[PDB]
Amino acid sequence: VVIGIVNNTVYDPLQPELDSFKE
Amino acid sequence: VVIGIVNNTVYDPLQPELDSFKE
Amino acid sequence: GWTFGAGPALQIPFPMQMAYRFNGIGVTQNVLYENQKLIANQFNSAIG
Ligand SMILES: *[C@@H]1O[C@H](CO)[C@@H](O[C@@H]2O[C@H](CO)[C@@H](O)[C@H](O)[C@H]2NC(C)=O)[C@H](O)[C@H]1NC(C)=O
Numbered sequence: 001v002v003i004g005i006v007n008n009t010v011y012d013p014l015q016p017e018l019d020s021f022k023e
Numbered sequence: 024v025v026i027g028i029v030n031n032t033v034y035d036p037l038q039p040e041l042d043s044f045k046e
Numbered sequence: 047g048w049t050f051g052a053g054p055a056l057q058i059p060f061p062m063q064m065a066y067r068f069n070g071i072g073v074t075q076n077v078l079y080e081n082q083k084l085i086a087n088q089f090n091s092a093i094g
Pocket residue numbers: 005006007
């Protein structure tokens with residue numbers, strides 16, 4: 001619905017933090 | 024101490040994320 | 047925008063200036079970002 005919205009990726013800080021200790 | 028406070032539940036975004044991949 | 051009212055004239059697209067001027071009154075910019083067409087039509091009808 002937004003006009004002019006571009007394609008890019010965001011960075012989740014929890015994704016690389018959960019797997020370094022649990023996995 | 025707060026007057027008029029109602030009983031309800033909040034959502035923790037960490038809770039479903041931590042056990043989905045580690046467990 | 048109003049950036050020429052403090053120093054040099056720094057350009058900005060008018061939907062984004064509209065978004066921050068909506069942010070200044072209390073609402074968030076997303077309400078504008080899916081009500082842009084309605085806001086523009088309301089502005090045009092009022093100025094007519
Ligand atoms: C951003 O990336 C998405 C990919 O999800 C693009 O979505 C595609 O849109 C076209 C046109 O509607 C569809 O035919 C494709 O099937 C969509 N891709 C997928 C994977 O479903 C979107 O167009 C991209 N936007 C920009 C501005 O590049």
